[PDB]
Symmetry: D2
């Protein structure tokens, strides 16, 4: 159920393939921030989740460097996939920018993104 195209509330698009062994691979296009076009993502998911209706744990990373630009930053999303009629990937994220040691205290933004199969 994870493989495919997902949309979040910001207008971003997350295109992922879930491998049999726990691999996530794909591309991410952000509607906001210091970003243009698609970026490589990689991550992992629980490939033998519980079957009690609980979600499937997963996470992925994007480093915000592609052929077009480099924001000198990286985001990780941690969350879970919930299937069914209203399928969702519910996440929290951490965006770290490369900083000097003196500015390290303000290096990391936190937020939440909910991904759905329709936008």
């Amino acid at each position: 159920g994870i493989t495919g195209t997902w949309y979040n509330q910001l207008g971003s698009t997350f295109i992922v393939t879930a491998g049999a062994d726990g691999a996530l691979t794909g591309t991410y296009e952000s509607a906001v921030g210091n970003a243009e076009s698609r970026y490589v993502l990689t991550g992992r998911y629980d490939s033998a989740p519980a079957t009690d209706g609980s979600g499937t744990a997963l996470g992925w990373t994007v480093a915000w460097k592609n052929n077009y630009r480099n924001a000198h930053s990286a985001t990780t999303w941690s969350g879970q996939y919930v299937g069914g009629a209203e399928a969702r990937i519910n996440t929290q994220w951490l965006l770290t920018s490369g900083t000097t040691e003196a500015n390290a205290w303000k290096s990391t933004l936190v937020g939440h993104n909910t991904f759905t199969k329709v936008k």
Copy 2:
């Protein structure tokens, strides 16, 4: 650089290879939690960082399933590599467990881990 064997303040072991086009691959062994032995990790790093003294942004994920056990959880680490005499990787992390909808509010732990190449 980033490639090597790293240890955090909990005694966990992070073995990573940084590929030329931005890939991180390796293994993670946690000294704590519902975990034993090594788990696969993948991630990304900025393969052309700024040259002004800024760190190198990176992140990686571990899903806590291996041949021995499955915690039905995953952790991401977001942070930066800081080079120099004593290299460091400074991170914050999010650990999400699979939950029911009613328990989703308590799905995710947050913390910080600093990694160095110094064995416990």
Copy 3:
């Protein structure tokens, strides 16, 4: 404004008074977790926000001890009040439980709550 009775997506009830000195005071009742009835809260907000359409920054704390129960934990909410026609308070929160030193790595939960007066 901020003063009033607010509810989040979990069904918790946040009753707050915003003082002109930047103080928040009131009570919190959680619909979830190791909690019953009302808990005291205190916090702060920006009492002279920007006039350019930006939200009003705020935060508050609840320690989960009252006359009935003690969870040995505390939550902080950090966020902003958005005054539109349908006012909201959008937050992220940290819940720290008291732990031993060896379990401190797993002391703190993170999440998000959005509050409305509906």
Copy 4:
């Protein structure tokens, strides 16, 4: 144990009084950021912590407005006090700035601060 002056790794100073009723009141001076001089803080703590000597849960808020400046922002710290010879308050924090709705996704910084009774 909590009442007094505390220092973090950034060089900031936290002066707090812990009331019998669970109240934290005091002032905070940040060494970094859009801040000068002292700011009011208020918070809460567990006035009856566990008998097994676990830490004492607590939190507090600073809105970054005083008589000298207004950053249009607020920080909350959530953590625990640990007593004894090397007493500490170990925290994670969230700093939210007032933003437009369009910029709300980048409103909130996260970090960690460890407070000690002696300045590092």
